[PDB]
Every structure is written in structure tokens, then in C-alpha cells.
Amino acid sequence: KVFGRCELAAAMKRHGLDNYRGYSLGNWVCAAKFESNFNTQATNRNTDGSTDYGILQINSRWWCNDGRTPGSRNLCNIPCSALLSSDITASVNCAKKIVSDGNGMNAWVAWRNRCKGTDVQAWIRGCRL
Ligand code: NA
Numbered sequence: 187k188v189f190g191r192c193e194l195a196a197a198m199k200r201h202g203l204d205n206y207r208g209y210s211l212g213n214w215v216c217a218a219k220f221e222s223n224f225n226t227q228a229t230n231r232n233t234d235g236s237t238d239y240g241i242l243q244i245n246s247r248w249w250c251n252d253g254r255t256p257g258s259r260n261l262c263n264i265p266c267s268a269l270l271s272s273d274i275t276a277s278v279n280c281a282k283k284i285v286s287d288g289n290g291m292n293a294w295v296a297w298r299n300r301c302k303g304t305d306v307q308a309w310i311r312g313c314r315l
Contacts, residue, residue, distance in 0.1 A: 187272035189224040191215060192313035194241070194274075199315055201278035207285045211315070212306030213297070214281075218242060219309065220296040226277070227270050240269035240277045242284075242294065249280050 189197065195215050198204065204211040221243035222228035230238045236247035236255045246255040250266035262280035269277050284293045291297045 187226045189218075189226070189241070191219075191224070191309065192315075194218055194224050195310045195313045195315060197274050198278065201275060203278055203281070204315075206282055207290060209285065209291055210306060212309040213291055213301060215309035216301035216304070216306045217291060217294045217297040220300045221294060226272055226274065229270070237266065239266040240271075241274060242269075242277050242281045243296075244269050244277065244280050244284065249284060 195211055198214045199211055203214045218224055218241045222241045224241065226241050228240060228243065230243060232238065232245065232247070234247065236245050236258060237252055238245050239250060244250055244262070246252040246266050247258050249260070249262045250264050250269055251260040252266040262283055264276050264280060269280065285291055287293065291302070
């Protein structure tokens with residue numbers, strides 16, 4: 187599924203991401219925009235052989251099981267394929283554990299490089315929330 191900007195903002199809010207660990211909804215929408223372009227089916231191979239899955243490009247190195255990432259963990263206790271669902275529940279639940287792990291949204295390098303410190307409220311402007 188490719189979400190609209192306001193459609194994803196609404197889904198993230200419904201799933202309790204809005205101000206989760208102090209990150210306003212604009213931060214989550216901005217991160218999703220640059221990680222996946224709002225496409226739940228996005229996958230990208232990392233040089234280390236891990237893979238990133240879904241709207242928030244969650245990495246098989248630590249967070250999900252894809253069966254092809256040697257020496258990796260599955261800290262969200264999920265098949266990485268669950269991160270590709272049109273339903274964002276598994277991505278949201280797993281993103282709550284990632285952003286809780288000590289470095290907040292810096293875990294998303296595209297968030298650090300493209301969202302952090304910017305006018306992230308612009309990402310939910312005009313949305314009926
Ligand atoms: Na893994």
C-alpha cells in the first residue's frame with residue numbers, strides 16, 4: 187500500500203505514534219516519507235547483507251526475522267514480511283521499541299539527515315487528525 191501523507195498521519199496517530207517518546211507526528215511522517223515514500227512494500231538491501239522492510243525501513247540486523255541475515259536478532263519477535271502489510275500495526279509496534287532503545291529517532295539515519303531540526307509540522311499541515 188502507498189499511503190497518502192494525511193492518511194498515514196491518521197494511521198500513525200490511531201496506533202499511538204503521535205508524541206511517542208516525545209516525537210511529534212510530523213517527525214514520524216517525515217521519516218516514513220524519506221525511508222519508504224509511504225510505500226508499505228519498500229525493501230532495501232544493506233551492504234552488510236541485512237535488509238530494511240516497510241514504511242519505516244526496519245532492519246533485519248536487529249528487529250525482525252527474514253532467515254537470511256547471519257548473526258542477526260529479532261527483537262520485535264516478527265517475520266520481516268509483517269512489516270510489508272497494508273496494516274501498519276507491526277511496523278508501528280516495532281518502531282516504538284526501536285525509538286525506545288536509547289538514540290530516539292537517530293536510529294533512522296534518513297530522519298537524522300533529512301527530518302531532524304526541520305519544520306516537521308509541515309508534514310501534517312492541512313490533515314484532519
Ligand atoms: Na534478524
